[PDB]
Structure formats: structure tokens, C-alpha cells
Design a protein around this nucleic acid. Structure first.
Ligand code: CA
Ligand code: CA
Ligand code: CA
Length: 71
RNA sequence: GGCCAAAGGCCCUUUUCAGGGCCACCCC
């Protein structure tokens, strides 16, 4: 119950997926939230012990959730 | 420590609110 991912391979791939998400306009238009809840869209911990599907699963849900953030 | 979200095990891509691959489970 305490793990930090070391594999540079895994961390890059995961960073990329995250970087993608921040590069969206929805994330830009998320200057309207003070660190908040879990009902919000929070980027997955890249350092978390996660399975491949698990992390990808989270990321999918992350990006979708983002889209609540622009008309 | 535990519990939850996510999660079949991995793998590719800016088709990325997305598309795909291998294996496994299923239906034998
Ligand atoms: Ca679940
Ligand atoms: Ca599932
Ligand atoms: Ca399946």
C-alpha cells in the first residue's frame, strides 16, 4: 500500500497522455477551480501503481470529463 | 493499514469526448 512507479517507459507514456489532456482548451478553461473535489476531473497519478487498462481507463474518463469545460 | 474511483494482461496512435492491435475470458 505504498508504491511509486519507476519505469521511465511507463512514466513517459503516462506523461504524454496527461500532456495531451492539458493541451486541450477545456483544461486551459479550468482556471476556474481552486484546489477541488473528486466530482471534478483530476489528472490520474502517473506514479500510482496501476494496470495498463486501469490507467488508460482513468485517462479516458479524464478527457471526457474535461469537456464539461467549454461552450 | 484499509476502503473507493479506474482496472482482463499487455501494446500502438493526437481519428484523442477518438481509432486500433496481440493474448486471454465469453459464446465452448
Ligand atoms: Ca468499478
Ligand atoms: Ca470492464
Ligand atoms: Ca474485452
Amino acid at each position: 500500500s505504498s508504491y511509486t512507479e519507476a519505469d521511465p517507459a511507463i512514466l513517459s507514456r503516462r506523461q504524454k497522455q496527461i500532456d495531451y489532456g492539458k493541451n486541450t482548451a477545456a483544461y486551459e478553461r479550468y482556471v476556474e477551480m481552486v484546489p477541488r473535489t473528486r466530482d471534478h476531473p483530476r489528472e490520474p497519478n502517473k506514479y500510482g501503481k496501476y494496470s495498463r487498462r486501469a490507467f488508460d481507463g482513468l485517462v479516458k474518463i479524464w478527457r471526457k470529463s474535461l469537456h464539461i469545460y467549454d461552450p
